[PDB]
Structures are given as C-alpha cells and as structure tokens.
Amino acid sequence: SGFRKMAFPSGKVEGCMVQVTCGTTTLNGLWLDDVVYCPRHVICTSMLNPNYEDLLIRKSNHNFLVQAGNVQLRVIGHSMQNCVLKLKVDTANPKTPKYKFVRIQPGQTFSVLACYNGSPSGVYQCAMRPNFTIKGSFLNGSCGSVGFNIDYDCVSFCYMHHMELPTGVHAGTDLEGNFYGPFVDRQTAQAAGTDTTITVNVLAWLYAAVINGDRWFLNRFTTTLNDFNLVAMKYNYEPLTQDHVDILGPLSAQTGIAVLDMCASLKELLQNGMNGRTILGSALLEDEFTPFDVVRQCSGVTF
Amino acid sequence: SGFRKMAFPSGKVEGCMVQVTCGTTTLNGLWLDDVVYCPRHVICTSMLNPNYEDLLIRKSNHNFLVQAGNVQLRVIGHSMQNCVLKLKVDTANPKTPKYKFVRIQPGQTFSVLACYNGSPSGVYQCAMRPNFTIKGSFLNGSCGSVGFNIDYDCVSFCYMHHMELPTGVHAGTDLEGNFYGPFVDRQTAQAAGTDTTITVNVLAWLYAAVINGDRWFLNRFTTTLNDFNLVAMKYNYEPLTQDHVDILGPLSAQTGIAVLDMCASLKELLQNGMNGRTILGSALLEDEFTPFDVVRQCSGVTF
Numbered sequence: 092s093g094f095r096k097m098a099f100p101s102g103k104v105e106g107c108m109v110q111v112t113c114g115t116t117t118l119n120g121l122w123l124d125d126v127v128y129c130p131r132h133v134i135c136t137s138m139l140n141p142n143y144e145d146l147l148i149r150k151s152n153h154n155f156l157v158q159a160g161n162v163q164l165r166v167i168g169h170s171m172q173n174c175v176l177k178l179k180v181d182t183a184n185p186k187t188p189k190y191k192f193v194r195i196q197p198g199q200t201f202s203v204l205a206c207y208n209g210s211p212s213g214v215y216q217c218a219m220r221p222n223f224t225i226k227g228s229f230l231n232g233s234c235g236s237v238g239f240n241i242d243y244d245c246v247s248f249c250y251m252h253h254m255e256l257p258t259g260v261h262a263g264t265d266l267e268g269n270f271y272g273p274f275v276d277r278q279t280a281q282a283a284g285t286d287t288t289i290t291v292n293v294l295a296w297l298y299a300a301v302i303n304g305d306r307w308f309l310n311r312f313t314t315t316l317n318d319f320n321l322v323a324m325k326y327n328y329e330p331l332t333q334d335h336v337d338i339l340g341p342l343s344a345q346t347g348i349a350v351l352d353m354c355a356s357l358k359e360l361l362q363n364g365m366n367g368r369t370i371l372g373s374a375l376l377e378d379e380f381t382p383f384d385v386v387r388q389c390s391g392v393t394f
Numbered sequence: 395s396g397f398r399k400m401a402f403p404s405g406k407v408e409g410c411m412v413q414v415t416c417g418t419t420t421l422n423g424l425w426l427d428d429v430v431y432c433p434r435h436v437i438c439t440s441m442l443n444p445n446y447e448d449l450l451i452r453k454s455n456h457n458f459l460v461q462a463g464n465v466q467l468r469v470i471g472h473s474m475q476n477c478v479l480k481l482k483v484d485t486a487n488p489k490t491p492k493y494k495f496v497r498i499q500p501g502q503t504f505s506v507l508a509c510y511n512g513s514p515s516g517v518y519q520c521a522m523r524p525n526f527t528i529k530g531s532f533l534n535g536s537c538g539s540v541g542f543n544i545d546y547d548c549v550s551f552c553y554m555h556h557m558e559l560p561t562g563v564h565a566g567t568d569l570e571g572n573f574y575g576p577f578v579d580r581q582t583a584q585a586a587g588t589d590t591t592i593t594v595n596v597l598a599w600l601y602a603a604v605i606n607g608d609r610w611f612l613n614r615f616t617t618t619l620n621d622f623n624l625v626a627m628k629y630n631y632e633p634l635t636q637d638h639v640d641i642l643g644p645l646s647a648q649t650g651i652a653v654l655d656m657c658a659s660l661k662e663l664l665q666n667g668m669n670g671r672t673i674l675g676s677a678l679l680e681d682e683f684t685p686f687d688v689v690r691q692c693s694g695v696t697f
C-alpha cells in the first residue's frame with residue numbers, strides 16, 4: 092500500500108553524467124559511447140541573438156574541457172545538431188547503458204536527475220505539461236541534466252534541460268536537440284503558453300486512490316464522454332478521448348469502476364471541491380501520474 | 395527555481411541490492427563487503443509467535459539462496475542481530491560504497507529504494523513520522539528495501555523495510571535490526587500511535603516557499619515561542635524548541651525573516667487556512683522537508 096511520486100532508479104544515468112566547460116561556462120553533458128551531448132548554449136558568452144554556426148566555427152576541440160569524475164576526456168571532434176552540441180571523445184563510456192532517444196508527448200512523465208558540475212544531486216519525477224514546459228527544480232549550472240524513463244534495462248532519454256523561464260518553469264529539448272514547445276535558446280521575451288490539466292492522468296490517480304482504499308469520492312452516477320468534456324473545458328482540463336478511455340481500461344477492469352463512472356466522480360470534484368477531505372494525501376487533484384505510472388507502482392514492476 | 399520532493403541518486407545503493415530466498419519466502423537483502431543484511435522474518439513460514447532463535451537453529455547455510463543479478467552467492471555463515479539476519483557470503487561486493495549505519499531521529503528524511511526480487515523498482519523520499527512509521531509505497535516482496543541518505547560520497551543507511559501496518563503505513567528497523575517504534579516482527583495486533591505534524595519541517599518548507607517567491611502568507615506580526623507552542627499543541631503540531639529555532643537560523647538569515655516571524659505566519663495558516671491559495675503547489679502544509687533538505691535543494695549541493 093501507499094502511493095508516492097516515484098522516480099526510476101538513477102544509477103544507469105549517473106554513470107553517464109560529465110562536466111563540459113567552454114571558457115567560463117560550465118554545465119553538464121551526457122556521455123554515451125564515445126559522444127558527449129550537451130546544450131549548445133555552452134559555447135556562448137553574452138547571447139541576445141547568438142549565431143551558433145559562427146560561434147562554433149570559431150571553436151576548436153581544445154576549447155572544450157570534458158571531465159568525467161576525476162579524469163579529463165579528450166575531445167576529438169565537435170558538431171551541432173539542432174540545439175545540442177555533440178562532442179566526440181577519445182574514450183567510449185564503459186558504463187554506457189542500453190539506451191534510446193525518444194521524443195515524448197505532453198502528459199507523459201519522466202525522471203529527472205538534477206546535476207551540477209557533472210555530479211548528480213537528486214532525482215525526482217515530473218510531467219511534460221501541455222504547454223511543453225516542466226515544473227522542475229533547477230538552479231544555475233543544472234543545464235544538461237537529463238530526463239529519462241527506464242523499461243526493462245533500457246534507458247529512454249527524453250529531455251535535456253536548457254533554460255528557466257521567467258515564471259520559474261523549465262524548457263528543454265529531446266536528445267536530438269529539438270525544443271519541446273515554441274522556445275529558442277537565446278535571451279529574448281519568451282513565455283509559456285497557457286497550461287491545462289492532464290485529464291487522463293487525474294483519472295489514473297483517482298484509480299490509484301481507489302486501489303489504495305480512498306472511495307469517498309465515488310458515486311452511483313455515470314456521464315457521457317460528451318457531457319464530461321463539456322465540464323472539462325469549463326475547468327481548463329484537456330478533452331478526454333476514446334484513446335484515453337481505452338488506455339484507462341486495465342485500471343477500470345482491476346477496480347471494476349467504468350471509466351465514464353470515474354468521470355462522474357471527477358465532475359463532482361471539479362464542481363464541489365473536496366469539502367475538506369484529501370485523496371492520497373493531497374488536497375488538490377493530481378495530474379502528473381500516467382495510467383502506466385499507476386499500474387507500475389500498484390503492481391510492482393522492476394527494472 | 396522550483397521545489398520538488400527530491401531523493402538522492404540511488405546508483406550507489408542499487409549495486410548493493412540482492413535477492414534472499416529461504417524456502418518459499420523471497421525478499422531483498424543488502425550486500426555490503428562480504429555480508430548480506432535482510433529481515434529475519436525471511437526464515438518464517440506461518441509466524442503468530444515465532445521463536446526466531448529456534449527457527450534459525452534449524453537452518454543451515456544451504457537453506458539460504460542469495461542471488462545478485464544473475465550470479466548466485468554462496469552463503470558461508472549466518473547469524474541474527476536483533477531483527478536482522480546477517481548472511482556471510484564467499485565474495486565481497488565489488489560495488490560496496492563508502493557507507494555507515496545510522497539510527498535517525500523522528501522528523502528526519504531519507505530516500506527509499508523500493509525493490510522486488512533484488513531488483514530496484516523506484517526511488518522516493520519520505521520522513522520518519524513522530525510515531526515511528528513511514529508513509530511509504532510498498533507491495534508484497536518489498537521487505538528488505540532500504541532507506542538512506544548520501545553525504546559527500548558516503549551512503550548512510552538508516553532504514554530497512556519489514557512490515558506494513560493495517561492502516562497502510564510502514565514499519566522497519568535500522569540496519570542493526572532495531573525497530574523504529576514499539577513494533578515487533580510477528581503477526582499480532584499492532585497499530586501505530588497517534589501521529590503529529592513535524593513543526594520545524596513545516597517552517598523549513600515555508601522558507602523554501604519564500605525562497606521561491608511565494609510570500610502571500612507573510613505578515614508583519616511576531617509571536618513568542620511560548621505563544622506559538624500553545625497554538626501548535628492545539629493543532630496537533632510538535633512543540634518547537636530553541637534547538638529547532640537555531641537549526642532554522644541559516645534559512646532565516648538568507649530570507650531575512652526571523653523564525654518567530656515565520657511562526658506568526660504559520661499560526662495564521664493554522665487558524666485561517668489558505669483561503670483557496672497554494673504554497674509550492676500544495677493546498678496543505680508540507681512537513682516532510684527538513685531544514686537541511688531545503689538548503690540542499692535551494693543551494694545546489696551534489697554527491
């Protein structure tokens with residue numbers, strides 16, 4: 092029993108984190124096989140309208156200092172792919188895990204290994220918000236920290252950290268260096284779009300609550316998908332789709348509560364609040380657990 | 395910016411987790427140097443009044459199957475210390491970190507690496523509640539999972555998981571096998587004592603909120619320690635001590651808000667609620683961050 096914001100074990104990623112210095116700028120990089128991936132804004136000084144092709148043309152391999160733990164790695168090549176810098180090094184990472192690069196959809200969750208000067212600091216879970224930001228915990232020097240999922244023993248990297256927006260939320264790229272969202276890696280007026288709540292995740296979390304013995308919010312009613320989405324839109328919730336309903340199938344089956352039955356509970360909670368009760372220790376509706384996250388944690392899968 | 399329930403990177407612990415089988419009972423063990431530590435109830439069948447000295451007298455080394463990843467470890471000795479079984483094995487763990495065993499005080503936090511069949515599943519943060527339980531996330535097979543902190547590169551183990559209580563909370567021991575709280579490792583009528591909120595942690599978390607730009611709960615008032623503890627007791631909060639005030643010193647200094655000034659904020663929040671506002675994304679007062687946790691995460695320390 093119990094339900095917690097659970098990250099994946101981070102050891103496989105910790106062995107990949109290095110420090111990348113270029114001039115006076117230091118940040119983190121990801122060392123897989125003989126390549127080190129890091130944000131390209133490492134080659135910047137100050138930055139309002141940087142021309143990165145020019146900035147990189149003016150660099151040489153010896154302008155890049157890469158340290159893995161205590162050993163310095165020799166850079167033997169450098170190139171840029173979108174907003175990521177790729178530094179070829181002379182030695183392949185002996186700790187390289189089985190891995191893949193993936194570009195996730197909004198509403199999906201991942202583990203973040205926050206790092207400073209190439210040294211892991213902590214691990215936490217978060218979600219790609221519908222507005223393509225993440226509500227992380229990042230200080231100066233955290234750029235290059237990665238987000239990931241782990242299936243079987245394969246690490247799927249899905250996020251590298253680049254920037255903190257003025258509202259305190261965070262922007263980054265997939266590991267091919269494509270930003271999530273409309274953002275660009277320069278100092279300009281940038282702001283996240285309006286955000287919405289991830290409906291399918293809230294429902295998943297209600298199922299986890301039921302699985303853990305919180306039932307007070309259940310009712311006998313049912314709603315139509317169309318009637319529910321009318322209420323969703325009113326409270327700034329993402330529309331619920333038949334894909335979402337099918338994804339919730341196994342949780343619906345394990346609890347015996349039909350998805351559209353749970354939607355009637357969610358409607359009431361949106362309309363009437365919680366009246367001083369809590370769900371899974373929260374006074375607010377939680378939306379950073381996917382259906383997969385719930386099944387994993389209430390079923391016990393390992394990696 | 396940002397504030398998240400952050401666990402320590404778990405790699406150093408992942409390399410220590412093994413599976414320990416005795417008959418039909420399988421659980422996790424912790425492999426440090428040439429010893430494997432696990433809950434002694436692994437040698438039980440069913441268990442209401444087990445006599446563990448007798449149960450262990452009847453065992454031999456070959457009744458214990460220890461698997462580390464894919465390799466089976468040869469048990470060459472066995473003994474019991476309090477509620478922990480210690481199995482001497484023929485091979486010292488080559489991945490043993492620098493480590494220590496520590497017995498923590500209630501209100502202190504730690505990272506939990508949940509494991510099944512010796513394989514890490516996830517990592518999360520929690521606190522030793524004042525009633526010596528933890529609100530973890532554990533399923534059958536999780537016994538033997540450990541809780542830990544990491545300072546510099548030294549892993550301080552402070553919890554091994556033994557049991558789930560009927561209320562869904564969790565009971566365990568230090569790594570010397572002494573239970574936290576009044577619990578015993580047998581099937582009987584056991585229930586946690588009444589719990590209280592960790593006042594010093596709530597104040598620490600209010601400081602983190604201020605550090606991250608949430609100020610709406612601040613006021614111009616101040617309170618006496620005595621007057622505050624009168625309100626604390628009313629709302630089932632632990633008394634605040636001068637030790638607690640001194641521990642909050644650095645957060646008080648960094649924000650310029652005196653501790654007793656923050657206590658007046660907390661008093662108002664206890665009396666008047668939040669009136670539909672949130673702090674650090676929470677509608678409830680959070681009490682599982684220590685002052686040290688706040689400083690670490692709002693200052694950027696690594697391990």
Ligand SMILES: O=c1[nH]cc(-c2cc(-c3cc(Cl)cc(OCCC(F)(F)F)c3)c(=O)n(-c3cccnc3)c2)c(=O)[nH]1
Nearest residue numbers: 116117132229230231232233254255256276277279281
């Ligand atoms: O030496 C070092 N110098 C600099 C950094 C650094 C650099 C940026 C950065 C980079 C770019 Cl290209 C654009 C940018 O714009 C702001 C957002 C908006 F522009 F979109 F509005 C910001 C940055 O956000 N952080 C940072 C701080 C706190 C949390 N998370 C990231 C750090 C470093 O880590 N080390």
Ligand SMILES: O=c1[nH]cc(-c2cc(-c3cc(Cl)cc(OCCC(F)(F)F)c3)c(=O)n(-c3cccnc3)c2)c(=O)[nH]1
Nearest residue numbers: 419420435532533534535536557558559579580582584
């Ligand atoms: O093969 C396996 N058999 C058994 C287990 C197992 C065994 C116990 C256990 C052990 C003892 Cl000694 C006493 C006990 O009493 C209950 C609490 C109270 F008694 F204090 F009220 C319970 C246990 O709680 N869990 C468990 C489940 C879910 C979450 N966390 C722990 C598992 C196993 O993991 N594998």
